[PDB]
């Protein structure tokens, strides 16, 4: 698609009889805009992007009351889950959840998501149809029958097709100078000598948004994944991203090799080289 | 905006 909105839940039990922790983060594409952490005296939902700040105290109470309720329910769920897998209170366990809507190349809903994991592995996921579930084992099937009796799938469909989409469009407009303004990467190639296998070429891409980018080294023959070190995309902190790919080995020369940058912020994919 | 969990929404 073109744009997405996602909520990430992390429910974690505490070592013994301790009260579990509930965390929620909300994203629109790669921009985080809200947070909740149950581990505070009086936990409140907080803004994390400058465009969600215009929202009234009714918006913030709705959020806070949903996450304060999730805190109590995810606690019951963590206990239900350790029962399924016959685990003691001794250990700490994690329920993770990802839900959200993808707007279309137009801006209508492409598809909806609702995936859960237990201790970092898939447990239950809402199918593309937003009507059925994919359970991983017999324990996730206990959750499926609970969620079928509670009409969870139908209530996700209503949310994802409506509420989720309306608010994403709302945020997209309110933050259109950030969320709808693609930042092209600040690109340069650096030279890092060694005499023996000869020097190293580092192709940088800096201060770009969204996170989706592609860096390849073409000595002509094509993209050559084997001799390239492609470091994964990292955030700079200013809501922008960084990435580099390097090659070693002229086996030829540093000027034979050219870097290729693919990003939305570019009118056409770049052809970058090292300039001595 | 997040979705509210209705009653009996537990794992």
């Amino acid at each position, epitope marked *: 698609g073109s744009h997405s909105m996602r909520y990430f839940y992390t429910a974690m039990s505490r070592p013994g009889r301790g009260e579990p922790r509930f965390i929620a983060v909300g994203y629109v594409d790669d921009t985080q805009f809200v947070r909740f952490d149950s581990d505070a005296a009086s936990p409140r939902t907080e803004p994390r992007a400058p465009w969600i700040e215009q929202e009234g105290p009714e918006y913030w109470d709705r959020n806070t009351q949903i996450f304060k309720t999730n805190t109590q329910t995810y606690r019951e769920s963590l206990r239900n889950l350790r029962g399924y897998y016959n685990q003691s209170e001794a250990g700490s366990h994690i329920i993770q959840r990802m839900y959200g809507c993808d707007l279309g190349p137009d801006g209508r809903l492409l598809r909806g998501h609702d995936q859960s994991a237990y201790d970092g592995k898939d447990y239950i996921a809402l199918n593309e149809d937003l009507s059925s579930w994919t359970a991983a084992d017999t324990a996730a099937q206990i959750t499926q029958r609970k969620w079928e009796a509670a009409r969870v799938a139908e209530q996700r469909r209503a949310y994802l097709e409506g*509420l989720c989409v309306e608010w994403l469009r709302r945020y997209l407009e309110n933050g259109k100078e950030t969320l709808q303004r693609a930042d092209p990467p600040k690109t340069h190639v650096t030279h890092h000598p060694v005499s023996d296998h000869e020097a190293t070429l580092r192709c940088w891409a800096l201060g770009f948004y969204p996170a989706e980018i592609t860096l390849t080294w073409q000595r002509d023959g094509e993209d050559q994944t084997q001799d390239t070190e492609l470091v994964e995309t990292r955030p700079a902190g200013d809501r922008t991203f960084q990435k580099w790919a390097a090659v070693v080995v002229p086996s030829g020369e540093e000027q034979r090799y050219t870097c290729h940058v693919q990003h939305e912020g570019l009118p056409k994919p770049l052809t970058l080289r090292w300039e001595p | 905006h997040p979705v509210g969990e209705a009653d009996y929404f537990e794992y």
Partner: T-cell receptor, first 112, second 111 residues
Framework: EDQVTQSPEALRLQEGESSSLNCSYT??????LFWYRQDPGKGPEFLFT???AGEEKEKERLKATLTKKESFLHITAPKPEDSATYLC?????????????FGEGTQLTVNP | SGVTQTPKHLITATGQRVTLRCSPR?????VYWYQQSLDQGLQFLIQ???????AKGNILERFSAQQFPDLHSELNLSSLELGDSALYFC??????????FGEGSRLTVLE
């Protein structure tokens, strides 16, 4: 922000005279709209639930329909036994739990 | 319905305290308290799920309720005023989301 407006508050029909009861609603996200029937002295009685615009539920002389803004409870050829208060309620997606926000109702009296 | 409310009727004086009992439907784990003031609609007071308080409406500080481990609820109304005269309904929610109401409790408060 959760408002349920029912019209008319009072309805005075002649036996056999069909009428439509309006229920206007504002919600963050619709979880479901409910129609209850309430007799004087007793508690609201569950009739049916509509989740999506175009969904229709029918129990005898009562038919309910849903739009993105309102719900209609159509009463066909009413009888004196249909005289009661008809309550409209809504469940919100943007709030927790299954709580209902009630409308003030449509007090119906069917003249026999 | 399946929900049971006691007492169905209560006549007390101003400044007194009353306790309203509610048993949800067999199988239902939640309790919802509603107030229906004379010639006025149902107003959400408080909700309990499995002995634990969840959602809170416009229940007064003077009012308190709780859900017991056997799932039954008690709504206590203290420092009673004439205006506290209403119909008090409790509802239990189905697993599929519909609420089911009791007969109610009609409280009349007199000077």
């Amino acid at each position: 922000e959760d408002q349920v407006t029912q019209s008319p508050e009072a309805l005075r029909l002649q036996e056999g005279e069909s009428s439509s009861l309006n229920c206007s609603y504002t919600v963050s996200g619709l979880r479901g709209l409910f129609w209850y029937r309430q007799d004087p002295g007793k508690g609201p009685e569950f009739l049916f639930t509509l989740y999506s615009a175009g969904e229709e539920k029918e129990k005898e002389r009562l038919k309910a329909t849903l739009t993105k803004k309102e719900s209609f409870l159509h009463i066909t050829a009413p009888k004196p036994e249909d005289s009661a208060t008809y309550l409209c309620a809504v469940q919100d997606l943007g709030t927790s739990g299954s709580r209902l926000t009630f409308g003030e109702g449509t007090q119906l009296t069917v003249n026999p | 319905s399946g929900v049971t409310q006691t007492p169905k009727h209560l006549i007390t004086a101003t400044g007194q305290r009353v306790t309203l009992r509610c048993s949800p439907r067999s199988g239902d784990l939640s309790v919802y308290w509603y107030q229906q003031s004379l010639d006025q609609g149902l107003q959400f007071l408080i909700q309990y799920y499995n002995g634990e308080e969840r959602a809170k409406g416009n229940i007064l500080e003077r009012f308190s309720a709780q859900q017991f481990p056997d799932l039954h609820s008690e709504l206590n109304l203290s420092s009673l005023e004439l205006g506290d005269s209403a119909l008090y309904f409790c509802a239990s929610s189905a697993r599929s989301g519909e609420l089911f109401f009791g007969e109610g409790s009609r409280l009349t408060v007199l000077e």
